[PDB]
Ligand binder design. Structure first.
Ligand SMILES: [K+]
Ligand SMILES: [K+]
Ligand SMILES: [K+]
Ligand SMILES: [K+]
Ligand SMILES: [K+]
Ligand SMILES: [K+]
Ligand SMILES: [K+]
Ligand SMILES: [K+]
Ligand SMILES: [K+]
Ligand SMILES: [Mg+2]
Ligand SMILES: [Mg+2]
Ligand SMILES: [Mg+2]
Ligand SMILES: [Mg+2]
Ligand SMILES: [Mg+2]
Ligand SMILES: [Mg+2]
Ligand SMILES: [Mg+2]
Ligand SMILES: [Mg+2]
Ligand SMILES: [Mg+2]
Ligand SMILES: [Mg+2]
Ligand SMILES: [Mg+2]
Ligand SMILES: [Mg+2]
Ligand SMILES: [Mg+2]
Ligand SMILES: [Mg+2]
Ligand SMILES: [Mg+2]
Ligand SMILES: [Mg+2]
Ligand SMILES: [Mg+2]
Ligand SMILES: [Mg+2]
Ligand SMILES: [Mg+2]
Ligand SMILES: [Mg+2]
Ligand SMILES: [Mg+2]
Ligand SMILES: [Mg+2]
Ligand SMILES: [Mg+2]
Ligand SMILES: [Mg+2]
Ligand SMILES: [Mg+2]
Ligand SMILES: [Mg+2]
Ligand SMILES: [Mg+2]
Ligand SMILES: [Mg+2]
Ligand SMILES: [Mg+2]
Ligand SMILES: [Mg+2]
Ligand SMILES: [Mg+2]
Ligand SMILES: [Mg+2]
Ligand SMILES: [Mg+2]
Ligand SMILES: [Mg+2]
Ligand SMILES: [Mg+2]
Ligand SMILES: [Mg+2]
Ligand SMILES: [Mg+2]
Ligand SMILES: [Mg+2]
Ligand SMILES: [Mg+2]
Ligand SMILES: [Mg+2]
Ligand SMILES: [Mg+2]
Ligand SMILES: [Mg+2]
Ligand SMILES: [Mg+2]
Ligand SMILES: [Mg+2]
Ligand SMILES: [Mg+2]
Ligand SMILES: [Mg+2]
Ligand SMILES: [Mg+2]
Ligand SMILES: [Mg+2]
Ligand SMILES: [Mg+2]
Ligand SMILES: [Mg+2]
Ligand SMILES: [Mg+2]
Lengths: 145, 118, 50, 100, 221, 152, 110
RNA sequence: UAUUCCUCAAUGACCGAUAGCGUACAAGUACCGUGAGGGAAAGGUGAAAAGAACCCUAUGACGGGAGUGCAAUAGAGAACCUGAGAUCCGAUGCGAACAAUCAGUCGAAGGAGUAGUCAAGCGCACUCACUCUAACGGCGUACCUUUUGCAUGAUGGGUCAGCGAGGAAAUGGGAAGAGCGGCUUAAGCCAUUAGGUGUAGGCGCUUUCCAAAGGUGGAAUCUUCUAGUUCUUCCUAUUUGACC
RNA sequence: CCGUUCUCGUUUGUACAGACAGACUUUUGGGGUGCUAAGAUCCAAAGUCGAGAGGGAAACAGCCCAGAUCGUACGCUAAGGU
RNA sequence: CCUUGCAAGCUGCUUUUCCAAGUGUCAGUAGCGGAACGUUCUGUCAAUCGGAGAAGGUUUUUGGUGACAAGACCUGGAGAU
């Protein structure tokens, strides 16, 4: 159990447990962004975004995630630059699906040599919904009456 | 689950009690199906006898999409894997993913234009 | 390397010795010179516990 | 260049052990040198083997010295240490742009 | 239950068509208790069906297809493909290259393998509980209704094979010939494929004694 | 499934190897010239096995030797050790005469006698009794051993 | 590959190449070869596009691409080129902050 | 014992209309040749003809209605069950007369058509929604055969559908699997809703050198080891037309 | 004789092959023949193609770099460039 | 796929599986080896499916590394395995 937590931390996520039906985590859009690293790939996200990552092995559907590798934070007024990561910043997410992508055909042929090969491949991806960015000050509610 | 709402609504287990190609789904019904039924209280699982036909699993989703996976001559673990992939799916059409970052607000500070001053 | 450039119908173009090619040659020379220095320093005796 | 990562950060002296890293490709080279590299345990590019410092190893390195980077134990340890110290965490930078 | 394949003698009840009690019989363990092997049965069944195949299948070579041996046109000059006849294997109406010719499909099998297959079949029938031993196979009449009444009386059966020691009496022959689910054989004609086609096996005491006597006699050589 | 023999469920120990069907597609690995390569007699199947290319073959360069004696006599060899092993097992009565019928019946001779039996000296240390033989031929050592034990 | 699969892959082809199996098979096989090659080539093209957008973004503030990217490496800032180009396009003030940081890290020659 | 111009009965892991006889149909016909001779093509409405009275428009109903029929594109006159493809003429959407190339591929502005999901108020933003098209950009000289090497101005193919070439027997060299422990029968014989028998023969035991005569003590000492053979499947070889 | 490789790639029995038309480059600085000609021809020693895609040499069998199990709009390099 | 472990059965106390790691391998003509897919026919089958619409045909969707498989609408009208 701790080994899976350590490996998920190496990838850059932490499982916080299942999403309860009482929680309302899908709030309206806030003008802050974060850059997070999940595996080899980096994503620049705001809340309400969706990202497709390479398959995360240690989470299930509707699990709340904390993304542990935050490289940059930004807003309309300031930018916080991590060298390389920001330990005090947290980005929250929810696992939405694990699905296979559309099949790609791998075709090889060498002309006049009586050689050809055809095979398929389907890559499995994990879809995450970004719900919350922490570590940078969000703008106040400007109740324009 | 799309924003916390589970998308797969019904799992149809179609099988034959006579045919040799339904051995794996019959073993799946006896062995792995109650555990999957227990772990998914939000999912309705119905089982249908279809004599003389090859077995399949059918997944009916919130968006009224239906996906059928034939499981003829499969081992029970392959049937369980297919049922798990049906449960983990959002029911979308199998087409190429055009992007891996879906956003409606690409810019917080405003997109670069020729009018931007620094 | 091919050194035949003014005969025949098959064109082997002469590779010009540019400054970038000289830089790559100097990098390869630095690598082999450091290797030779390591071999000179380590060649005075043999490691024990065999 | 790529050799810049392998430049010595420590004075080069006699060593107990040697680290050998293949930095050139195999096709287009003599089959004798490829067999020598196979005898050193090097089959793929950018791979590192560790060997004791004696004349039998040194002659093999001398044969293929234009294909490899040979490092002492101290040079290898210093290179790995500087690489780890470069990627270590530093405090964040906060820049307030604002006011357009 | 019991461990099949220990070569142990078995005790079986003896009855008749009238559902009476006729005592008990001991079945020899080297015939009715051999280890059960699917591969030997597979080979014996394949041998039987290969021996059964008629092989009266035929096609015509170019020597037998009607047509002239004359070259159809000149080898050169017409702009067409060169042909020797108009009855070649690539021609419509032509010969069949590597087509079937009438031949026997029979293969060979050792006698001891056939004996072992018969032993395995009898052992499986005795092990499943689907072997019934009759004191005799005498019927009061030649009418098929007696056999139909006994078949309806029987328990969890579909197809029955009835084995007689000597030649079959005329009454049983007439009574069973209109039934596709009850078939008869003398003990000289008992074979693995006939046993496996019927889920229940009915043998008289004479048939059991003749089969065990045959298996206890070594092959003369 | 217990002791079932259904025609539905019979198979061999190993899966059946099927025939290699040449001249089918690329993926089979034996299409387009099958496994014959390109041209020559061997691709066109007009080559006789054992032909050596026009050099005088070894079957015609070596001399013939000797003749065949049409009246050669063939005798079956039996060692004394086999006879001793069958004497100790009760198959052979060592007090009565050991003829070729005695050796033939106990299987010391194979199926076909041809012209008789030659008694040999293999395993002669196992002869411990006076034994009397009536064979066609006998080696010198076998006769020496049998008479040393008081037989003939 | 079956004839029906080939006709599925030849959908939208011009002329008799969508329709006739002898003509369709060649064009479909060539299309599949192009698809295999272009899965490799897309990564080269997209890295070129990111580097062009970063170079345009940083030269507006007087910094060349190579000095900028090396100044970011020197400060242990490990943002990759795709995200850096997205910042140069969509968050220009954060990108200007990164340009200032890299120029303090590594001005280069001149 | 041989054969089938013939008869009667029966069988088929034989074929099913480009197959099976050359001929499922009035075929040794039509047709070709002076002649000997060569030699086709062509099966299927519907259960039953109930095969469409009558009307309308054409010179003329095969058309449009009507009626029959379960069904009428099931409406034919040596042919109508199903009804594919090449091929021909249309309808709708998008592109298309300032831009060149195996005609795609990877990106993609725009245009057009179309669904559904539901917390909160019966809108609206969500499903990268989905489908068709593709301005514009980057990359991209068919396939087969034969060759040292082919975009090659080397070969072959107008297209589509159907057909089209490693196959059988016996006897050898082997491998894998199995039976028996000496193994195995051949012809035949008795039976077949089906097997059972049959020892003649073959290989081994078995003896090694040798032209032939002649000649012939395996290993081991510590309760001794001391032989194969017949099938099945597959790969190869020989003789057969022997992959075409 | 002793290190390194830990791989059997070694030797040998049995069974199945294919192949016995090669091409170019390494100062004409390994040589012969030819004219110190040939994209000639014939040998020695390497490499590549043959049977090898990818990047460079404008385009490019044989030169330089380098060996394609698959996926990614991640990263570092070689030759060669800016 | 291989190697090394690990744990299970075996009989073999050693040969087969399951799992985990592997900076271990995986261009390929002639050619060799291994593993499969599909067609027709036969046994299993006087069994199973079929006006609750078979075979065949057109669309469309889903699955596998692939040959290919499978669901549904339409067409079809009696067979399929
Ligand atoms: K003729
Ligand atoms: K034809
Ligand atoms: K005909
Ligand atoms: K019809
Ligand atoms: K029609
Ligand atoms: K294009
Ligand atoms: K020509
Ligand atoms: K053989
Ligand atoms: K054996
Ligand atoms: Mg030229
Ligand atoms: Mg050139
Ligand atoms: Mg300069
Ligand atoms: Mg360089
Ligand atoms: Mg003829
Ligand atoms: Mg003639
Ligand atoms: Mg014919
Ligand atoms: Mg091959
Ligand atoms: Mg071909
Ligand atoms: Mg071959
Ligand atoms: Mg050829
Ligand atoms: Mg040849
Ligand atoms: Mg016809
Ligand atoms: Mg037809
Ligand atoms: Mg005909
Ligand atoms: Mg009419
Ligand atoms: Mg009909
Ligand atoms: Mg019709
Ligand atoms: Mg059409
Ligand atoms: Mg139009
Ligand atoms: Mg214009
Ligand atoms: Mg033009
Ligand atoms: Mg596209
Ligand atoms: Mg172009
Ligand atoms: Mg030529
Ligand atoms: Mg070319
Ligand atoms: Mg041409
Ligand atoms: Mg040419
Ligand atoms: Mg032509
Ligand atoms: Mg065709
Ligand atoms: Mg017989
Ligand atoms: Mg030659
Ligand atoms: Mg030659
Ligand atoms: Mg040749
Ligand atoms: Mg030569
Ligand atoms: Mg030279
Ligand atoms: Mg010369
Ligand atoms: Mg020259
Ligand atoms: Mg030349
Ligand atoms: Mg020449
Ligand atoms: Mg050479
Ligand atoms: Mg060649
Ligand atoms: Mg090569
Ligand atoms: Mg190349
Ligand atoms: Mg180029
Ligand atoms: Mg090149
Ligand atoms: Mg590789
Ligand atoms: Mg390979
Ligand atoms: Mg249908
Ligand atoms: Mg059928
Ligand atoms: Mg079938």
């Amino acid at each position: 159990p701790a080994e899976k937590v350590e490996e998920a931390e190496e990838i850059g996520y932490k499982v916080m447990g299942p999403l309860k039906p009482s929680e309302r985590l899908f709030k309206p859009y806030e003008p802050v962004f974060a850059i997070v690293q999940i595996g080899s790939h980096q994503f620049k996200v705001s809340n309400g975004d969706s990202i497709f990552t390479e398959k995360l092995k240690f989470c299930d559907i509707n699990d709340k995630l904390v993304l542990t590798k935050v490289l940059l934070l930004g807003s309309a007024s300031q930018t916080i630059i991590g060298r390389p990561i920001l330990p005090d910043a947290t980005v929250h997410a929810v696992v939405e699906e694990h699905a296979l992508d559309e099949k790609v055909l791998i075709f090889k042929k060498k002309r006049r040599k009586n050689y050809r090969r055809t095979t398929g491949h389907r890559q499995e991806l994990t879809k995450l919904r970004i719900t919350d960015i922490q570590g940078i000050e969000k703008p106040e509610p400007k109740i324009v009456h | 689950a799309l924003r916390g709402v589970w998308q797969l609504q019904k799992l149809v287990v179609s099988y034959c009690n006579w045919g040799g190609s339904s051995r794996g789904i019959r073993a799946f019904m006896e062995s792995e199906l109650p555990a999957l039924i227990e772990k998914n209280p939000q999912l309705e699982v119905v089982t249908e006898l279809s004599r003389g036909q090859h077995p399949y699993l059918k997944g009916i989703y919130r968006n009224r999409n239906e996906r059928v996976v034939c499981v003829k001559n499969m081992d029970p673990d392959q049937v369980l894997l297919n049922a798990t992939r049906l449960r983990n799916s959002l029911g979308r059409k199998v087409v190429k993913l055009r992007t891996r970052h879906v956003t409606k607000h690409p810019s917080v500070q405003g997109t670069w234009t020729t009018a931007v001053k620094f | 390397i091919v050194k035949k450039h003014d005969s025949g119908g098959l064109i082997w173009k002469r590779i010009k010795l540019t400054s970038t090619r000289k830089a790559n040659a100097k990098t390869r020379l630095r690598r082999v010179w450091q290797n030779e220095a390591v071999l000179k320093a380590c060649g005075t005796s043999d490691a024990s516990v065999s | 260049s790529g050799f810049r990562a392998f430049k010595a950060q420590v004075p080069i002296q006699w060593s107990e052990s040697l680290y050998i890293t293949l930095v050139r490709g195999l096709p287009g080279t003599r089959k004798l040198h490829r067999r020598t590299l196979e005898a050193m345990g090097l089959r793929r590019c950018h791979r590192t083997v560790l060997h004791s410092n004696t004349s039998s190893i040194r002659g093999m390195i001398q044969q293929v010295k234009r294909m490899v980077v040979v490092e002492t134990e101290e040079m290898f340890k210093a290179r790995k240490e500087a690489e780890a110290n470069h990627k270590a965490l530093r405090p964040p930078l906060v820049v307030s742009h604002s006011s357009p | 239950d019991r461990t099949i394949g220990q070569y142990q003698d078995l005790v079986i009840p003896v009855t008749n068509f009238q559902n009476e009690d006729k005592g008990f019989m001991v079945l020899a363990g080297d015939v009715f208790d051999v280890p059960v092997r699917k591969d030997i049965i597979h080979h014996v069944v394949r041998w039987q069906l290969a021996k059964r195949q008629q092989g009266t299948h035929s096609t015509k070579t170019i020597s037998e297809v009607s047509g002239t041996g004359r070259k159809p046109w000149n080898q050169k000059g017409t702009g067409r493909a060169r042909h020797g006849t108009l009855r070649g294997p690539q021609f419509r109406g032509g010969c069949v290259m590597h087509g079937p010719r009438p031949r026997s499909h029979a293969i060979k099998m050792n006698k001891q393998v056939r004996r072992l297959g018969l032993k395995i079949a009898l052992t499986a029938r005795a092990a499943e509980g689907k072997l019934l031993v009759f004191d005799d196979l005498a019927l009061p009449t030649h009418k098929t209704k007696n056999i139909v009444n006994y078949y309806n009386q029987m328990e969890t059966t579909k197809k029955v094979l009835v084995v007689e020691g000597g030649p079959i009496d005329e009454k049983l022959k007439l009574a069973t010939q209109n039934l596709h689910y009850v078939n008869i054989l003398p003990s000289i004609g008992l074979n693995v494929y006939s046993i496996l086609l019927h889920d229940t096996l009915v043998m008289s005491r004479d048939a059991v004694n003749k089969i065990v006597e045959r298996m206890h006699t070594p092959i003369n050589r | 499934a217990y002791s079932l023999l259904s025609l539905n469920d019979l198979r061999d120990n190993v899966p059946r190897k099927l025939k290699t069907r040449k001249g089918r597609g690329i993926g089979s690995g034996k299409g387009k010239t099958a496994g014959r390569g390109h041209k020559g007699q061997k691709a066109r199947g007009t080559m006789k096995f054992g032909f050596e290319g026009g050099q005088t073959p070894l079957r015609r360069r070596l001399p013939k030797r000797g003749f065949k004696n049409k009246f050669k006599l063939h005798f079956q060899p039996v060692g004394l050790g086999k006879i001793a092993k069958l004497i100790n097992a009760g198959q052979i009565d060592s007090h009565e005469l050991i003829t070729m019928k005695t050796l033939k019946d106990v299987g010391a001779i194979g199926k076909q006698i041809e012209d008789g039996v030659r008694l040999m000296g293999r395993g002669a240390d196992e002869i411990k009794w006076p034994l009397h033989f009536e064979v066609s031929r006998v080696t010198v050592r076998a006769k020496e051993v049998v008479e040393a034990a008081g037989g003939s | 590959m079956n004839k029906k699969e080939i006709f599925k892959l030849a959908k939208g082809f011009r002329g008799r190449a969508k329709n006739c199996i002898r003509i369709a098979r060649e064009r479909v096989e060539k299309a599949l070869q192009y698809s295999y090659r272009d899965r490799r080539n897309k990564k080269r093209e997209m890295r070129g596009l990111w580097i062009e957008r970063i170079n345009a973004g940083s030269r507006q503030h007087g910094v060349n691409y190579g000095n900028f990217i090396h100044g970011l490496m020197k400060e242990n800032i490990q943002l990759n080129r795709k995200v850096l180009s997205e910042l140069s396009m969509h968050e220009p003030y954060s990108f200007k902050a990164l340009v200032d940081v890299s120029r303090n890290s590594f001005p280069g020659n001149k």
